[PDB]
Amino acid sequence: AISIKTPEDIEKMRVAGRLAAEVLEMIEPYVKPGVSTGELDRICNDYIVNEQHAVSACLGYHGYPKSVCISINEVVCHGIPDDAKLLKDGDIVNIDVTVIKDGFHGDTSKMFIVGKPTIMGERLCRITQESLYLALRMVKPGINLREIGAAIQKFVEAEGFSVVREYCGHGIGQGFHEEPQVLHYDSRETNVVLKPGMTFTIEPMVNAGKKEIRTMKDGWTVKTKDRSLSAQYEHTIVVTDNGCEILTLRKDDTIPAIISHD
Numbered sequence: 366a367i368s369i370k371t372p373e374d375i376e377k378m379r380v381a382g383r384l385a386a387e388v389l390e391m392i393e394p395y396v397k398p399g400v401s402t403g404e405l406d407r408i409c410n411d412y413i414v415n416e417q418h419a420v421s422a423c424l425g426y427h428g429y430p431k432s433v434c435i436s437i438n439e440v441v442c443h444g445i446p447d448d449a450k451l452l453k454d455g456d457i458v459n460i461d462v463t464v465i466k467d468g469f470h471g472d473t474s475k476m477f478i479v480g481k482p483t484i485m486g487e488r489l490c491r492i493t494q495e496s497l498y499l500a501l502r503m504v505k506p507g508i509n510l511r512e513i514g515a516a517i518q519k520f521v522e523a524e525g526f527s528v529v530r531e532y533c534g535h536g537i538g539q540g541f542h543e544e545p546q547v548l549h550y551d552s553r554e555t556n557v558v559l560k561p562g563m564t565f566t567i568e569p570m571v572n573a574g575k576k577e578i579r580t581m582k583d584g585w586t587v588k589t590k591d592r593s594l595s596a597q598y599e600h601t602i603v604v605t606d607n608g609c610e611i612l613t614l615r616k617d618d619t620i621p622a623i624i625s626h627d
């Protein structure tokens with residue numbers, strides 16, 4: 366559009382964003398060696414539907430068959446939960462949740478390391494999260510999204526890693542994937558000035574190796590071409606008069622929910 370949310374709209378996004386975040390806090394103790402991604406997905410859907418009184422935006426959307434996306438190791442994104450896929454020590458696992466409540470969407474993802482961490486896994490997860498946080502700290506009215514993507518890329522590359530090009534952040538509200546596209550790297554194509562009341566996600570995908578990615582024969586599951594590890598974190602935000610408010614913050618986040626400039 367780009368769609369500006371009213372205060373009422375924003376309050377409903379606060380509620381959907383909290384619910385999405387709560388799914389991620391809930392699922393954590395279940396993420397252990399020997400659990401399958403299929404069970405994790407069931408637990409999440411059961412929780413969203415029967416405790417939260419909400420629904421998964423994933424389920425049925427363009428025919429997607431499950432309720433969350435679960436992406437392990439070299440899978441970059443859109444991993445499909447499966448009863449036969451079991452987690453094991455050292456795995457890094459992204460769970461991407463999107464909840465609809467009262468017509469509004471809340472979208473967020475985080476990494477989990479399973480059992481005994483490996484050093485590359487810990488590092489990649491930490492740097493990815495730090496790249497999301499740096500971008501969040503830049504959001505305010507007047508800024509251009511190009512600057513934010515540029516800053517993500519500079520940081521990630523300086524840390525020896527690479528930024529997935531083909532996937533980005535997005536506006537969100539009564540629609541799951543709204544304008545604008547929120548690129549996580551510098552592009553001359555990008556020119557979006559932020560205004561208060563915009564709501565969008567930042568969701569960098571970072572590869573320990575080379576940025577290149579291959580989609581699977583299923584035209585969907587995405588892996589890293591060099592089979593390097595890939596990590597992602599995502600938050601949903603609203604642009605405020607002097608900053609942003611994070612709508613999907615968790616107790617384990619180490620960034621304030623409200624960021625203020627001046």
Ligand SMILES: c1ccc2[nH]c(-c3cscn3)nc2c1
Pocket residue numbers: 422423424426427429434443532533542
């Ligand atoms: C579940 C179902 C359909 C989904 N379509 C998206 C998507 C489009 S651009 C970035 N993400 N993600 C999905 C997750």
Ligand SMILES: [Co+2]
Pocket residue numbers: 443
């Ligand atoms: Co997606």
Ligand SMILES: [Co+2]
Pocket residue numbers: 461462463472473474568599
């Ligand atoms: Co998401």
Ligand SMILES: [Co+2]
Pocket residue numbers: 472473534535566568599
């Ligand atoms: Co998203």
Ligand SMILES: [Co+2]
Pocket residue numbers: 487
């Ligand atoms: Co360490």
Ligand code: NA
Pocket residue numbers: 436437438439440441442457458459594595596597
């Ligand atoms: Na991954």
